[PDB]
Amino acid sequence: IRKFKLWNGNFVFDSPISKTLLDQYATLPNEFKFMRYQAVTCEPNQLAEKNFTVRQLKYLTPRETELMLVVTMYNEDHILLGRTLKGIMDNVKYMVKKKNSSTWGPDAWKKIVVCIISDGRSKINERSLALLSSLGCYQDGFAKDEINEKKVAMHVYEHTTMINITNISESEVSLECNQGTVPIQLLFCLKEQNQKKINSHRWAFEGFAELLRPNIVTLLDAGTMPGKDSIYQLWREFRNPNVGGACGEIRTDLGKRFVKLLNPLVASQNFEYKMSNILDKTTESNFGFITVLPGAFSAYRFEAVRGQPLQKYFYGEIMENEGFHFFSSNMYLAEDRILCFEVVTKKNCNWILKYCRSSYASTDVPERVPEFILQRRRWLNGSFFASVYSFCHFYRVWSSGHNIGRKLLLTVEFFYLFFNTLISWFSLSSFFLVFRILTVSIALAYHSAFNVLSVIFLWLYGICTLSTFILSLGNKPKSTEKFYVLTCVIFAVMMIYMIFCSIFMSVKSFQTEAFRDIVISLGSTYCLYLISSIIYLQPWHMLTSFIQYILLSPSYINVLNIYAFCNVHDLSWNPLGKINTTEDGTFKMEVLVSSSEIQANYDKYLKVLNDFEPSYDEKKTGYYANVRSLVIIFWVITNFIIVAVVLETGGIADYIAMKSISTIPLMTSKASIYFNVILWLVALSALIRFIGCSIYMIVRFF
Amino acid sequence: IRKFKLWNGNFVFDSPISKTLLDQYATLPNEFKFMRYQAVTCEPNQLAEKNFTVRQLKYLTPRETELMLVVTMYNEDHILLGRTLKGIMDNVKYMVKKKNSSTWGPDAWKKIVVCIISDGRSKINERSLALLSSLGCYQDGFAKDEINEKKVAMHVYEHTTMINITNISESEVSLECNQGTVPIQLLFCLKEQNQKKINSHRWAFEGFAELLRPNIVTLLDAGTMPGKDSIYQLWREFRNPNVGGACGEIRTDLGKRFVKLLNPLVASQNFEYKMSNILDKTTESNFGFITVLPGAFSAYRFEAVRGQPLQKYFYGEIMENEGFHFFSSNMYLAEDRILCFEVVTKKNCNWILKYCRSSYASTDVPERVPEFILQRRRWLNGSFFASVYSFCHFYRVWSSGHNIGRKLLLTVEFFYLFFNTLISWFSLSSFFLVFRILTVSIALAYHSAFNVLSVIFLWLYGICTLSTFILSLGNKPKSTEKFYVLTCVIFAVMMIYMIFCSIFMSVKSFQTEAFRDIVISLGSTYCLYLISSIIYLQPWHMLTSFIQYILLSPSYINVLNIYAFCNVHDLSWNPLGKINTTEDGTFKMEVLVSSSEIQANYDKYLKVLNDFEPSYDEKKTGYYANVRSLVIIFWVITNFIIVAVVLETGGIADYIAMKSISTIPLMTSKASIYFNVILWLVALSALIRFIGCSIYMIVRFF
């Protein structure tokens, strides 16, 4: 029991580390041998005012940081955090061993701070706090819930470690310390209660970034392992002073010797990631605005995001009455994609976002249908809302500081992105119309067993779709996994049948014009994908992973989208006294004994018979439910309008028949026109993205 | 403080009442001047063993009860409880003033106990505890949460009051005491925490009824006001020794001078109640098994329900493994209807249930669409499950003790009840098929503007139905009231249009055979209703309330049923330390100072890196969700199968067309056959129920 003293009114303690670490370290200054705990009781935007600091400012010469790396955990195990930290450590070692550089050199580790923001003490895993402790950046015992009647909001552990991670097997993490290791300035933040990730970013940007004043702030998730040069290659993107943000490639981690490529769900995701990087990101980067993918690690120039972008990201549209507005109350769905928008359309500034193909990070993807569905629920809602928001507010592009040509390019890009969003909104009707027109056409033309197959597949589609709607509105994907797997299999068999029908009709026609169009259009859209993959110099996914993606595409359209739209907002709808008796059964009491007090109580109850909206949380819940259920209805109705126009469903064929009688066919020419239009749109999108990727590679190569 | 003593180990206290009551009372024995609080810490089935008692057993001559009246509250205000208590008091006064009776006489009040079981202290209203206190049956202060480390489960207040309720206006309750008043033995039970109503019945039947040993146990809800002779007329039903249960008529309370009859929702309910009593209850009572309506007050002969019926009602099918079974885990949905079944099919006993028309009780009905929907959610699920359970287990009728004729009658009745259930399961398709066939037929025949009307009403029906499904699966009726009112109005206009179409086609035909059938069948089914109402001697609802019921019938089919099926089960998915500092900012702490303990903690975290289904409530929640969502899917699919068979939807007309091509019409003869069959079923049901009501009245009159 020792005597302490609050330093400037807040608790700062310095503990020594165990001699086991010292044994490696010797093989010595102050930062290596101590670990500093601080109890942060204030808001993220008030740390300096309240007089809280970081070790970097307190040296004889204050230490200036070039690069702040933020790692966010919620409950990730020690393997994921180990992978992220090992990638970071390897990158820092690469930068420290750099020879001909003005910025990096033997003491480059002093310019990098690794800030690990974990979200809740109750929600952290103990295998992660055991890894963090083994590095030297955590000791238990001196965390406090409250200090001078002030609720402690966050615990900050600061250390500079010499030990590095050198191997991460399936079970063990290899930690070692020798002359080849590089020191890392860790900064472990542990929030007291679980607020979501935007609050973690609030702590990173409004909090420690204000004290450290980094040049670049890099965002990573736990489990995302950066490549061996990814951080350096992303940092190299910022030598253009106009770059305000940047991102790299995100790769599926295929496992040992690509063993996980046997899983159809994983190969489908591998193909999807490779094409999203090759086609979408390059095309976007040509214009100057990128919509960074959820898994990839990104970097923002700190001066770029200060001001309006962070205010919109953290608070939303501040101007708001007691009620709820659409954009202001729903922008939390598009979490990081807001920042990017506000960086590009920042007033009087000509920041651009740029995509770096030289930097990559590999992540593990869901291997089971329920967790895959739950992961994509967030992605699809975020993308849809962000695209709607960017289209509705595009005039801001013209209030920024870009020159006239870049403003025109950005306007064109936003229009194109909303065109893509609009196409993706009508996929529910597009898939059904293509399937029904194709199967019915082959049944009409050849009659053999395609009649029964057409009816059977119509009923299978209907049953699976109705069940998906009902289970996603009412139940949870964990509860019914066999059904979801069966539905995916049913849709894969459906797609196989459609491919067969297309090939059969095309061969018979070659031995009418619509199937000429289908063969030319689909061959063209496959060839453009293949050539774009070759130009990017990453073609191997075009054969190892293509058929799996083709077979699972109907499940992307029909299971992921339905669940994403049905779950937009993740809704969640006096003490008396005691008796303790003695041995004799006796005890003492306070009892109303006087007649006057009994009469008083009687009069107080005789008085009640003579004198004859809930809280904000449930009001917000009601608004969220109303807005989530109005989206589903509009989606379904606007898709069925197109279905009924093309196929003459909804009693329309009946209506035309009876109008003529006042003075039904099997199929019309609307089906032919629509079938052609859909395929031409697909081929056109492929061609546009091919031109974009070609321009990207040509410019980078020059 | 004073010195007390536990009486036999449990807390029993006797407080005097305020002299204000004594002033009326004088205008005196022990029961009037004291109120007895008991703290019940045991289970309902253990009160006697634990040595708890009631005042009735503790006189010099123990008092024998003929009739125990149970009143259950949850949070009902003082007007509803006042109405119930006033009806009870008036009935007891009628029985006490009875002259030529062996059972009732001047001291008949001694044979009646009124047991008011309120559900939770936190959930009780204070205007109800103020009314209960004003009667003399409650004083606060001496309720206890725990007694000798035993959680007190329930508080029992016992008094015999001389004051009666004489008027209940919209705002005040008139209490008065004079020579004309009759004493009432009240027994106020107040549960500590809110378990649902089955637990209240568990306390009433397994608890106080075991001590009091009543002859009859009568169940009433708070707000249900018995008629001036209803309790006596129901008690008179039990002079037949074979009667095991009985119920009376439940009436809609139309307000002052029938002012509430202006509300269409209230007149519709008035007609529905009058026909459920006139047709359904009499027909059921002829056979010998009644399915007592939710609002009506019922009575059970206590010896009838002891044993198997109460065991099934309270616990369910006791034989059960760790998993969930359908019947055993879902019988709580059909709460009281289980008892009735088990009374009739009790082994070796020939108990019957009987319906009493001489006894009635009037209740208030919901006047707003959301609360109406929420009320009927419980009714519809209970009825559907109870009917399924009774049909599946009908063989028990033959294991009972009835003679052969009554066994045959009961078997026939259960078959007929399941036929009615099966008809009610297909109303979703029946209404749509009737509407679509009728509108399309008039459009075909006369062409003028019925084409547009047919298409418009098809789209209106589709939009309203899809929206009802989506809002009942995802949202709450309180949130969207304008939409539900609008949907009811839309369906009423739809029904008006259908009535017009029927009349138009019939008049044109009179100026083909199918409309002869429609006019004859509907005229017959209206005439049978009118004649049955006249035979029952209650015809006034056949004109004051008929059109409102007709207009709201589509909303009964399409809004109440969808919401009831979509909401079957009502699913619901270390401390650290503190710092207080002195003036100097100094304080004292317990800190790991020795190097050995720091090394110990480091080794304990280095150890975690080397040694590398939830609770029952959420498992039951998952089962309930699976079973609720499997019911909706089957309901929708089995109704659409009939729709697609009759109208040739679902690609079937396409399939027949292309089969013939291998070698679509507007309407077929299946529509004619189905249209006739539906109306013949309606007329047949009306005729059967008319014969039943006629037999009931004839037998009662003889």
From Swiss-Prot, chains A, B:
The chain crosses the membrane at residues 414-434, 452-472, 485-505, 518-538, 546-566, 630-650, 678-698. One of its GO terms (cellular component) is cell septum. Disruption phenotype: Cell lysis during cytokinesis. It is found in: Cell membrane. It is a multi-pass membrane protein. This is Chitin synthase 1. GO terms for molecular function: chitin synthase activity. The gene is CHS1. The chain holds residues 375 to 1125 of 1131 of the full protein. It catalyses: [(1->4)-N-acetyl-beta-D-glucosaminyl](n) + UDP-N-acetyl-alpha-D-glucosamine = [(1->4)-N-acetyl-beta-D-glucosaminyl](n+1) + UDP + H(+).
